[PDB]
Design a protein around this nucleic acid. Structure first.
Lengths: 67, 260, 62, 67, 67, 66, 68, 62, 67, 67, 61, 66, 262
RNA sequence: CGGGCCCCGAACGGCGGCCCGACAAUAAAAACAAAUGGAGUAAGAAUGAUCAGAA
C-alpha cells in the first residue's frame, strides 16, 4: 500500500548499482550507490559509509533512467 | 532566410542507405556541408548524390577511405577553392570553400584524433597550422562561415560527465585551449551558444545502443563564423535524428540573405 | 483524501508539465511519471524521484 | 477539526483573497478554489496545489467572522 | 524496532566508533553515540548532550563499519 | 516509547540543571526546564515560554547528568 | 585624459597611417586607417569617411606592428 | 569636435547616409539637423535618435 | 546645446503624436509622450510606464509632424 | 530633475508594486524601497540593488497620478 | 549607493551579481570604489560598475 | 580619486605580468597579458598588440592569485 | 580584573617532558588553557593521572602510531564541545589538529610537519599548507572567530631569525612556506599577538641541539598565535621565559583582556 | 573644400600664421577571390558545534 512504488524502484536502482547523486532537503549534493535500505533509513556505500535518514532527503537522482 | 546544414555523414554511401539524400532533398536549405565522403570526386559525380535544385561540389582525399568533403549549394557560388597549403590539408582535401557575394562559406573536417596517437599528433599539427592560417585570415574583408566538425568541445556545457572524458581525446586541455584561443582572442563566435545557451545539446554520440539510451553525446560540430555575421543569427537546432549519421545534423538559420 | 488523487491523475492524463518548488526555493519542471503517498517521479534528464513531504507548491504549465 | 473546517469553508464560500505564507517566508497570492484534509488548491491565473506541510501562516486580506 | 536502523545503532554503540552527526540545517555534531532510544540519541563528549532523532539528517561513522 | 527521553528530562528537572536548547532555525534559547510533557516544555527563564519538541534540535546541559 | 595613454597610441596609428581593424561592440569590423580623432569620434578613411563613435569601439587591433 | 563638421557637411550636401545603431540595424536617409544630444534624420518619417547610442555614420557616396 | 531635442519633443507631446520608441534591444513602444525631462520621458501608455533616456535609442512618429 | 524624483518619490510613498525591465529585457518585480541618483533598491523576497544605467523602463502595476 | 555596498562588504554577505550581459557572477565583496568592485572568489575577479545590473545578496541586511 | 582601487590593482597586475583573461560585455573572452593602462584604455600584449577600451570590459580574471 | 592566559610548549614526547618535571612548572604557573603539542604517545598515557593536570579537563588524540605525533590540551573549565580532525588525511590520520570549542575563541591546536626529515615530509607540508589555506579562505567568512594556536615551523620575517643568509635553504625560511604564511596573515587579515605587541628581536623559541647555538642564541621563532582579526584588538602582552629548554620549542605564553566563560 | 600642425582667450572655448591632402622612399609579410521583429528568456557549494537585526 504505502511502499508499492518506491520499494521496487529503489530495489532495482540498488541492484543495478547505478551511480546516484542524492540531494538533501538542505541542498547539499551527495553521491554514491545505495547498498541497503528498509523503511526509515537508507544506507549509502562510497569511500565512507554513510547513513541518510529518509525524512531529510528531497530527491534521489540516479545517473541513468531506470525502468 | 539563410539556412546551413552540417552532416558529417562518415561515408556518403551509408548516408544514402540511411535515407540522408531524401531527407536533405525534403529539407529546404540554402547550403549543405556534408563531410567525410569516403569516396572519390568521380563517385560523387553519380547523379544519385545530386540533390534536385542544388549544385554539386566535392574534393576527395588522396585515398578515398581517408576522408573527403562535399558541398551542395542552391545557387551557383562565385568560386570554389580547395586546400590550405598544409600537407595534412591538401593531401586529404579536408578543406573545401565556396565563394558568395559578401560572404564565403567553407567546409572543414578535422581528423578524429581518437583512433591512435599518430592521429592525435596529426590533429595537433593541423590545429596549429589552421590557427596560423586564420591569423593570416584576420584583416580579410570577406566574412566567413567555417562550417565544420572540430572533434573538440569548448566547455563542459557541451558534454556531460566531463570528469571521465578529461583524459579521453576530444576534451584534452590543449585542444580546448586552442579552441578557446581561436574563439575569444580572435573575436570569432558561435551561432548556437549565442542564440541558445542551453546544455544537453550534442551531435556525436557512440553508435552503441547503450550510449544512445543514456545519451553520451560529444559536441563536435560548430558553426564557426566571423564576428561580422554574429549579429545575424536566427536560431540553432540539433535534431535527434534516428541514427541517420554519427554527427547529428546541425541546422542553423541566419537573418542575412545570400546573393550571387 | 478526496481531492489530491483525481487532480494529480488528470495532471498526467492530459500531459501537463508540472513545476514543483522545493522548500529551499529550488524549481524543477517535468512530467510526473507516477505518484504515491510519499514519492512522486518527475520526468527530467533522469528519473528524479521526489518526496511528497518535500514539495511546497505545484504550479502546472496550464 | 472544530476550527479548521469552518475557517476553510468560510474562506472558500466568501472567496476572500488570502495571502498564503510559505515555511521559507515567501508571500504568495491567489484565490482558493477548493481545500482538502491535507492539501489546498489555490488558483492564481491557473490552479496551483499548495501543500499544508509547506504553509506557515494563512492571512486573509479581509477580516472574516467564524460561523 | 527496525530491520537495520536499530541494529546499525547497536553496532555503532558496541565499538563506540567516533560518529559525526549532521543536522538538517547543516551544522555538525562530534562525539560518540552514548545510547539511543526512539526519538532520542545520547552523545558522549565533553558533556552528556542529547540530540533528537527527528532532527538528525545523516549519520556518518568516522570508520567504515558494517552491521 | 520515550524510554530514554522521559528519564533524562525528569532528571534535568529534578536537578534543575540549566540547559541551553538550540532550535533548528539557529536562534538561541536559555533557561532551565521547569516541567514538560510529551510535546511542549515549560522553561525557567524570565519569560517561561513553551518550546515545541518538533522544533528542538539539541539539548546541552551546563553540567553532565546521569 | 589625465594620463592620456590613448593619445600617443592614436597619434602613432595616425602618423604612420597603419591599417587598423577597429572592432565594435555590436560585432562588425571596420577596416581602414585612422585619419583623425578627438574625444568621441575617430575618422576611418576607407574610400569614404566613417564617423565611428568612441563608446562603440570594443577593441582596436592594428594589423601592422607599431613600435613604441 | 570633428563630429559637427562631418554632420553639417552631410547636411549641406544632403548626401544619402547609412547610419548603423548600437544594435546594428542599418538606417538610411539624409540628415536634416543635429546638435550635441540628438540627430534629426530627413527620412520619410524623420526618426529622431539620441547621441548616446550611435555606432558609425557613413555616406553611401564619396 | 540641448536646444534641438527640447522643441522636437515638446511639439511631439503637444500634438500627442503616436511615437514608436525602439529600444536598443529591438522592442517596440507605441504610445504618446505625456511629458519629458532630464534622463526621463513619460509615455502615455495604458500604464504610462516611465522610460529612461540612456536606454532609449530612436523616436519615430507614425505620422510625420512639422518642426 | 523635475519629473524623475517626484515620480519615484510617489511610487515609494504609495508603495505601488512596480515591474522593472533591464536594458537586456529581463523582467524584474518588487517595490521601490528607496531611490538614489545612481541606483535603486527593489525589495522582492530578497532585496536586490539594481543600477539605474541598466534600467530600460519602470512599469507600475497600478496607474499612478503625479502631484 | 555607498552605504549599502559598504555594509554588504563589511558584513561579508554572500553576494551574487548579474552583469549587463546577464552573466550570474558569484563571490564576496572584497573592496569597491567609484568605478570598480573587487569580487573575491578564488581569484580577484574585478568587476566594473558600469557593467553591473543587479546585486543579489543571499540574505537581507 | 576615481581609480583609488582600480589603479593599484591594474598596476600590480602589470608589474607582476600575470596572464589575465578579459571578458567583454559582448561575451568575447580575451586572454593575454596587461601591457599598460590609463584612465579608459588597457593595452593587451599577445599575438596581436590589442587595445581594449575600459568602458567595454565586463570582467578580468587573472589566472593566478595576486 | 578579567584576564586569561594560554601556554603552548611543543614537548615533542610527553615522556621527556615528564622526566624533567614539566608537570610541576605547569601546575605552578596559573593559566586558563594549555595546548601541549606533539604528544608522541597514546591517549591513555595522557589519561593517566600523572600526566593529567588536577582540576583541568583533558582530551587527547594521537595518530595511527602513538610515537608519530598527536596533540592534547588541558582546559580549566568544561568546554561546550570538543572536535578533532579537518577532513584532510594529512591532519585526520596523524592527529595534527585538535580543537576544543568554547565561546567564540574555540582554542585550536595546530601542528605543521617540520619538513626537515625527508622529501616526503616536505611534500606533506606543502599539501597541508595548500589544504589549510583553502579551508581558511572558505572559513574567513564565518562568524565564529578562531585562534589557531600552533607551532608552524616557519619564520615569517627576518626579525624572527638572524643570519638569514645560510637559512635560505634551511627549513623555516623556505620561500613557498614564507609566502603562504604572509598570504594567510596579510591577504586574509590574520595577525599575531607577539609581533603586534612587541617588535623586539633576539627572542626565539626553537633552538638546535648544539649547545653552542643555544649559548649564542641561534634560535628560530616557529610559533605563531594565528588568530582571527576579531581578537587582534584585545591583545595585551606576551612573554617568552628563557628557562632551560624542555624541548625544541619554548612555552609561548600570552595574556588577553577578554574573560572566557562557559 | 578639410584634416594635421604651432599662435591666443578664460579642465574649458576658439581665432590667425602656415604645411599637406600622391609618405625624399618598409633589406622586402609563400601570396586581402578581387574595396529596427518589436511591449521585454535570468534549476541544486559533500554539511558556521549552533546568526534575535529597530524612524
Amino acid at each position: 500500500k504505502g511502499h508499492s512504488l518506491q520499494d521496487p524502484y529503489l530495489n532495482t536502482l540498488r541492484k543495478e548499482r547505478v551511480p546516484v547523486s542524492i540531494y538533501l532537503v538542505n541542498g547539499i549534493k551527495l553521491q554514491g550507490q545505495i547498498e541497503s535500505f528498509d523503511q526509515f533509513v537508507i544506507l549509502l556505500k562510497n569511500t565512507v559509509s554513510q547513513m541518510v535518514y529518509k525524512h531529510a532527503i528531497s530527491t534521489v537522482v540516479p545517473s541513468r533512467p531506470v525502468r | 532566410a539563410m539556412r546551413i546544414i552540417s552532416v558529417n555523414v562518415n561515408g556518403i554511401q551509408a548516408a544514402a542507405e540511411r535515407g540522408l539524400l531524401s531527407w536533405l532533398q525534403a529539407q529546404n536549405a540554402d547550403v549543405i556541408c556534408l563531410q567525410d565522403t569516403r569516396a572519390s570526386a568521380f563517385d560523387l559525380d553519380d547523379p544519385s548524390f545530386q540533390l534536385d535544385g542544388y549544385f554539386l561540389y566535392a574534393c576527395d582525399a588522396e585515398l578515398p577511405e581517408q576522408g573527403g568533403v562535399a558541398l551542395y549549394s542552391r545557387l551557383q557560388p562565385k568560386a570554389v577553392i580547395s586546400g590550405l597549403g598544409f600537407e595534412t590539408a591538401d593531401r586529404y582535401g579536408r578543406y573545401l570553400q565556396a565563394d558568395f557575394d559578401k560572404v564565403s562559406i567553407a567546409t572543414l573536417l578535422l581528423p578524429s584524433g581518437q583512433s591512435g596517437d599518430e592521429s592525435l599528433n596529426q590533429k595537433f599539427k593541423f590545429m596549429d597550422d589552421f590557427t596560423h592560417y586564420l591569423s593570416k585570415q584576420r584583416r580579410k574583408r570577406r566574412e566567413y562561415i567555417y562550417c565544420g566538425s572540430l572533434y573538440v568541445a569548448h566547455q563542459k556545457m557541451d558534454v556531460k560527465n566531463w570528469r571521465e572524458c578529461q583524459q579521453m581525446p576530444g576534451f584534452l586541455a590543449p585542444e580546448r585551449a586552442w579552441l578557446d584561443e581561436v574563439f575569444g582572442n580572435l573575436g570569432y563566435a558561435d551561432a548556437l551558444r549565442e542564440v541558445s545557451r542551453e546544455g544537453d545539446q550534442f551531435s556525436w554520440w557512440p553508435d552503441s545502443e547503450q550510449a544512445e539510451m543514456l545519451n553520451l553525446g560529444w559536441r563536435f560540430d560548430y558553426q564557426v563564423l566571423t564576428p561580422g555575421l554574429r549579429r545575424f543569427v536566427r536560431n540553432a537546432k540539433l535534431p535527434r535524428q534516428p541514427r541517420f549519421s554519427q554527427h547529428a545534423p546541425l541546422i542553423v538559420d541566419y537573418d542575412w540573405q545570400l546573393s550571387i
